[PDB]
Amino acid sequence: GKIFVSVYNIQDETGQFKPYPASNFSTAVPQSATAMLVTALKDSRWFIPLERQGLQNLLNERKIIRAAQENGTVAINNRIPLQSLTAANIMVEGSIIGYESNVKSGGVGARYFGIGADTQYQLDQIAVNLRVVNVSTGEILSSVNTSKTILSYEVQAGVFRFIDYQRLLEGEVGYTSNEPVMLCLMSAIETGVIFLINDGIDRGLW
Amino acid sequence: GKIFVSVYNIQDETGQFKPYPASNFSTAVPQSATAMLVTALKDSRWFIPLERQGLQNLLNERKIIRAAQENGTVAINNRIPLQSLTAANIMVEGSIIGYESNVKSGGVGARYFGIGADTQYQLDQIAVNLRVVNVSTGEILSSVNTSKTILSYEVQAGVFRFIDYQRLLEGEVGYTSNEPVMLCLMSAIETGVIFLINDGIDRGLW
Amino acid sequence: GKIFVSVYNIQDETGQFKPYPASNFSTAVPQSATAMLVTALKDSRWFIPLERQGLQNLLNERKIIRAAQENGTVAINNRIPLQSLTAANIMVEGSIIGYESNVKSGGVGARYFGIGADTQYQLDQIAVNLRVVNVSTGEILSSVNTSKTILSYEVQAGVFRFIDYQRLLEGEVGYTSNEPVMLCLMSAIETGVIFLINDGIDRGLW
Amino acid sequence: GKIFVSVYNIQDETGQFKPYPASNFSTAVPQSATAMLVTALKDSRWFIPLERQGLQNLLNERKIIRAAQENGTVAINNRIPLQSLTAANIMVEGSIIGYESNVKSGGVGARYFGIGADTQYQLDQIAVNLRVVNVSTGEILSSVNTSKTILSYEVQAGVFRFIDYQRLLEGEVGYTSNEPVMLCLMSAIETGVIFLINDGIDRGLW
Amino acid sequence: GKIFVSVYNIQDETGQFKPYPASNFSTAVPQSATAMLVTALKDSRWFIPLERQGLQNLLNERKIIRAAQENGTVAINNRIPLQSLTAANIMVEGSIIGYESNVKSGGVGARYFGIGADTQYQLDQIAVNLRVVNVSTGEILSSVNTSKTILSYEVQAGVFRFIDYQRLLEGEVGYTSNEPVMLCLMSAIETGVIFLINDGIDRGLW
Amino acid sequence: GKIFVSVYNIQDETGQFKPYPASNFSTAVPQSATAMLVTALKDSRWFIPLERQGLQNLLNERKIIRAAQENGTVAINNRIPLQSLTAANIMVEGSIIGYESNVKSGGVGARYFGIGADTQYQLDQIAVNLRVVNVSTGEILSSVNTSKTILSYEVQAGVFRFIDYQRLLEGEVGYTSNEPVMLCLMSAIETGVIFLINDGIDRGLW
Amino acid sequence: GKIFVSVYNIQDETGQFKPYPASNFSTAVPQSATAMLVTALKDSRWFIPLERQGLQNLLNERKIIRAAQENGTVAINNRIPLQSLTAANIMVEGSIIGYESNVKSGGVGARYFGIGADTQYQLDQIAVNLRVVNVSTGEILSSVNTSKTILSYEVQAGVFRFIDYQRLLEGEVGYTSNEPVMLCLMSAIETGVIFLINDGIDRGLW
Amino acid sequence: GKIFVSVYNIQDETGQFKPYPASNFSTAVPQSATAMLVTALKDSRWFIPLERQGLQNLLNERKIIRAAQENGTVAINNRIPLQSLTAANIMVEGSIIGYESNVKSGGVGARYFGIGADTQYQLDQIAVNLRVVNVSTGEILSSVNTSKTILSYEVQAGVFRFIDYQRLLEGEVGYTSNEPVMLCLMSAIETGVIFLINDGIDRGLW
Amino acid sequence: GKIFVSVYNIQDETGQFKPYPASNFSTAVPQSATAMLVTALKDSRWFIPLERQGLQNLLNERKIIRAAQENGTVAINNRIPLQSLTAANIMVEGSIIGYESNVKSGGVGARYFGIGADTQYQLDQIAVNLRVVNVSTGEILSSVNTSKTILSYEVQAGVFRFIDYQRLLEGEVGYTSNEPVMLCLMSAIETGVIFLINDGIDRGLW
Amino acid sequence: GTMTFQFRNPNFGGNPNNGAFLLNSAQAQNSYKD
Amino acid sequence: GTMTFQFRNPNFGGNPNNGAFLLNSAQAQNSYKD
Amino acid sequence: GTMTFQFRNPNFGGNPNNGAFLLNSAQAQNSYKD
Amino acid sequence: GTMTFQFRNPNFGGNPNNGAFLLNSAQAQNSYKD
Amino acid sequence: GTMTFQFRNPNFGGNPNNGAFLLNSAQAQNSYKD
């Protein structure tokens, strides 16, 4: 059987924003864990997530359902049987516990007569803490910290020499690749979920 | 039959804003999902969206209707039969889970004697999470993460050489194309809705 | 007969502000839909808008009317018969779902010996979502997304050559034209209203 | 007879502020409609405005009057007969629906040997929406959108040539004229009031 | 007899702040009308202003008076007979409806060999709306809009020529005069009060 | 006998802050009138100020006194007889109604061969409104507006000529004097208090 | 006997912050009077300060004491006899009424061939108002304004001449001294306390 | 037996943010202690952490469980026995008490003809306070302050000499290493937990 | 016996932030006294600190304990005997009363032909006020102000001369040392605690 | 708006960029020799 | 407004852009030889 | 604090003001002829 | 206001714009030859 | 306040404006020939 799991909020507790030129209010990490985590738990065949993030919308919609069919006049085909809000035995708390910008930068650039070329790389690091909590007792059944590096590299090449007496040939080829922080956060959350699963397996639970 | 679906809020959980020169408060993604999503669900022939975003306006208008015709004096043609607020069996929660600026930039620019030309491109990436929630039980029936790239390119060309002894001919032709983030967000939401539809089909529902 | 329509709020859900040199708090789109929309609905001969945006002012004024003539002492000519707040059968919700700055920029500028001239253009894009909602049931009867491009061009010309040995003639002629975003928003709202009208016609309603 | 009209608030829904060097909090339009509009309605010989903007001050002052003369001890000459708050049959809602900066800029500047002169102009545009609302029913009796251009021009001239071998004569004459945005807003509001008057005349009302 | 007048608040509805180098929070107009207006009404021999701006301080002080002498133990000389809060028959509402910076700038500067001199001027414009309101009925008895220009000029002169072979004489004389915006606001308020007085005279009142 | 006077708050209604380099939040005038005014009233031998600004601290301290000696156990020497909060017959309201920066700037600087010297001056202007209010009736007994100029000057001198073939003597002597805005505000408040005193003398009161 | 004195809050009513490069939120004066004043009153052998700033902490701690020993089970040695909150007969209100930056700057710098030296000084000014208030009646027993100058000087010297043909000797010696604003504020508060003491002595009190 | 420990909040009381180019809102330390600490306590085999940070989510989930199975209709296999919220005997309070940026910077860079190379290092310092509190009495059983240095170094090398007459060879190799502040904060928290454990061992507890 | 002491909050009343390049929100002093002070009191063998800062967490945890074992079903070994919240006889209030940046800067730098070297130093100053308060009476038993200087120095050396005809040797060695403000604040707090201890000893207490 | 007096010369009054042009334009008119 | 003393020379007092004009204007008047 | 790698050359890596000094100091040591 | 010590030389202490004027004014007084 | 180490040379350490003066002052003392 699949385990019902209630993810309420995976808060972005990193406190980091992006440096210039980015906006001062542009956070370094998406504020959208609890959706990457709910998706990681759903896509792992072990859990059934329950809403809990948007529970007020669900409760207002259940109010609307309950008030639409309390008079017994709704057409018996399109009436919605509200059973009860399915509850979870475990609960996955967590956070994005840290984002470090440029834990390891570097670059090598050479340039002979005219022709030159450089490479640059930056490694950010994002860490996610995931806690499986026992809802019966409140005890934290398990807690993992998963780190993921975010590689951003850049390769350029260029020519600025003279081809003839008064003929100048300039040229430039550039490429940049920033690993998405949302993809790396999803990868860290998926690894943390794999760890929580294997831990719950390896001691009694699950 | 068409399925009633209640979209309350598709929040912009990306946390991103636009970099300089843009304003610090100018978000990178429109705050206007739940309208792109309601339109995607309506334009797919599977769903009937219910308001739920503007439900307080609907409830105030129903108060006004109810107080206008409770005295039985309203002209029997222009009285409005309030039936009851139609309820949804499913509910589409979701978010814009991430916006990455320049996941892949690049450019090649050559320039021989006078005549030159360059190309530039940037790929942003926007990811949208969509969850079909079972309103009876609260269980998340399905959850998809759809990504969409936003291409922004730029081609320029120019001449700055001399035509005669003391005659300088300058010239420049430029073109830029930024893919609208609202169009790419609508495309990601439409793909996510297609996925939710095919998933609900492929297992029991729908 | 004309249909009473209740427009409560057409919110500016674009999240965009203007770039430098403009102020950081200067939004890219007017916050004044629900007045362009109420005017578009009134000027189309199909609808009678009801206030609903300024309804608290109307209710305070009706309190004042009701307290001015409850003692039966008001002069029988200048007493105001309050009938009841006329109610709408439909309700037009909506938003400005997106504003993209420079979806397509471009420019061509040539300059021979002294005499030069350039052209520049920028296309912004504004999208408006309009939903006709059924107040009886809450179901969204129709939902349209209308886009409108905002062209801003600029043509300059100039002379900076020498006419004689030591006689320099400089000259410059410039012209700029920014299409008003309020005019383009009004155009998008009018097109959306035309679409809502023709849709309500083309299926049963209206 | 003159029609009592209740103007509660003509909000500055333009969302615009002024660009640099101006402060970031310095709005592009005065926040002082409902005073230009009340003055436009008073100065047109058709309306008697009622306060409604400062109604809480009026109600506190009426509390003070009522508590000063409830004991019947006030000198019978300087007691203030409170009749009742005069009520309006119509109500003028509205907004400043848009301010566009530089809808049309331009300029021509020539300069021969030493002597030069330029002209510059900018046209802003301010749009005001005015709605006559029927307080009995709440229906919007009329709604007009009035636009007004704000011309700001600038003419300069200057000399920087040499008069003798080593004698340099510099000279400069400048003039600038910014049309006040408060004057243009008052003009747009007056035109909108003229339109509302002629409309109420041309169909039944007034 | 002198007319009691209740000035509650003359709000700075101009929305303007000062441009750079001034602070972003430094308003262009003093927030201190209702004190310039109360002084203008007092200094005109027609009105007796009542506090109404600082009425909560007056009510707390009257609470203190009332609680100090309710036990009948206060020394009969230094007990304060509270009569009742004197009430006004009229009430002067109003605002600073607009501040335009540089409605007319200009300047002329000449410079022959060494010796030069320039003049500069800027005209701001401040507009004040004043409404006499009838407290019995709430009707706006009169409403005036008074404008006042704020002249700020600047005259400089300077020498930078050579007196001998290698002897350079530099010199500079400067003067600047900014008309105080508080003085011009007081002048506009005094003119508006004169207009309100003459209007109340010229039709029945006063 | 000395008149008890209750000064609650002399608010800084100037709205001005200091220009760059000063902080954006650094007001141009001290927020500390009601302490300069209470001191001006105390130091004039006509008034006894009562606290009223810090009245909540006084009421909490009187609560503490009252609860410390209600059980009759306090040592009869160190018990504090609370009489009652002494009340004022008049009340001095007021504000700093305006601060103008550089109402009159100027400067003269000469420089012959090497030796030079300049002078600069700026006059700010601060205006304070003081109102004597009759607490029995609420009528404003008197209202004065006192202005005070704030002189800030600066004298510099300098030498930068050569004394020998290759010997350069540089020298500089500078002095600056900014009149404290707190001293000028205290002077304006003292002059306003002198005016209020002489006015209350010259008509009946005092 | 020593007089109990209750200092609630000595607020920083100067409104000043520090100029660039300092942060915009960095006030010019410590927000920590009421601790310099309580220390000045304690260190003068005339007063016993009572807490009053941190009175809520004291009341919560007394709640904890009272609830810890109400059951009569606490060990009779470590039970805390709460007597009652000792009350003050006087109360010292006050503020930092003003901080002027550079009331007097200046500097002299000479430089002969190579060797040079300069001096600079700035005088800030901080003013503190202290009021002794009579808690029985609320009357302000005394009020003093104490000013203190804050000297900040700087002496530099330097050599940049040549010692040989192609041998350059550079050298620099610098010293700076900023008088702490907390030390000068403590000095002003101590002088104000000395004045309050001598005043209370010189007329009846104390 | 393992000791239940309740970590409510380990607040970031350092008050520090990151310097330019980083955002102004980007804190210097992660706001994600209480997750590094809960993980440090769990990973030490001495403690069982209880949730307490996310206790409201746990209480809402227990409400949902309790309301799902109060009717006795839930399938007896998937009903969740709520026992009671397990309580802790001790409680670990704490903070990040300080972050110092560049407590020790340094660098050595040499460069002979063309070829050069430099090294740079910065040491930040982060201090964490951890308190074991006795929940029965409230007494602080133990309190430790752990400091950790954060090394950030950078090594660069480069060539910019000429290889032939007119052949210039440029080259650059760079490496940077910033120690993650989240890793150093986790190390400080782990050392503090080791100290708390050994202290509780070394005196009675544990 | 050891004295129970209740430290509620040692507030950072300095009002200072760090200058550029640091963030505008980065305070100059840690906000983490009450943890340095609780540690200073614990590490001095005279006091037992009680929580009081985190008392709400302690009270919620005691609620959880009390509700976990009120049914008498908890296993008799792992039930937690709540005794009562231990109370303090004294209470240490206090603040960081001031932070002065660069109370004494200075530097000496010499440079002969090529080889040069400089030294720089800055002294900040941090002052802490600590008050021992008598919880029974509220009287401030003792109050000390402790100051501590924060030395930040910097030594650099460098070579930039030529070794051969066209061979340039550059070199640089740098070292910087900023004394941690958290270490100096801890030192000031420890000295203040030593003073409070010796004072309580030297007069009766302790 | 507000107008504040500033010296044009970098000598006695602050703006240093003016001096480069000032000395050049004074030397462009310096008709003295010897 | 507030006036703060600043040295005109980049030598002893901070503003470096003044020095380029200062030395040139002192050399434009340097009438010494040998 | 945080340290981020940046290239010293304006060639391949961004800061353009370094290049003026770099080429001059490479030409001040250019001992090649012909 | 607050006064902070800064070196005038770009050599040992940071402000680089001073050096251009400093070396020129030291060469304008360099009376050494050979 | 806080002090952070920065290199004076634009070579190896960032501030490029120093290099123009540095090379000139190293050439003003370059006593080597040939």
Author numbering:
A (entry chain G), B (entry chain C), C (entry chain D), D (entry chain F), E (entry chain H), F (entry chain E), ...: 47 to 252
J (entry chain h), K (entry chain e), L (entry chain i), M (entry chain b), N (entry chain a): 20 to 53
Verbatim from the authors:
To improve the resolution of the cryo-EM structure of the CsgG-CsgF complex in order to accurately locate side chains of 9 Asn36 residues of CsgF that consist of the upper constriction region of the CsgG-CsgF channel, the purified CsgG-CsgF complex was proteolytically digested with chymotrypsin to remove flexible regions of the CsgG-CsgF complex that may affect the stability of the complex in the detergent-containing buffers and increase particle heterogeneity on the grid. The resulted protein sample (denoted as the CsgG-CsgF20–59 complex) contained a variant of CsgG that includes residues 47–252 in complex with the most N-terminal 40 residues of the mature CsgF (CsgF20–59), as confirmed by mass spectrometric analysis. In contrast to the oligomerization state exhibited on size exclusion chromatography, the CsgG-CsgF20–59 complexes tended to form filaments with varied lengths on the cryo-EM grids. As expected, the 2.9-Å cryo-EM map of the CsgG-CsgF20–53 complex allows us to ascertain all the side chains of CsgF20–53 unambiguously—in particular side chains of the 9 Asn36 residues that consist of the upper constriction region of the CsgG-CsgF channel (right).
Curli are functional amyloids that play critical roles in biofilm formation and adhesion in many Enterobacteriaceae. Two outer membrane proteins, CsgG and CsgF, form the core apparatus for secretion and assembly of the curli structural subunits. In this work, we show that CsgF forms a stable complex with CsgG via a 1:1 stoichiometry by lining the extracellularly faced lumen of the nonameric CsgG channel via its N-terminal 27 residues, creating a secretion channel with 2 constriction regions for curli subunit secretion.
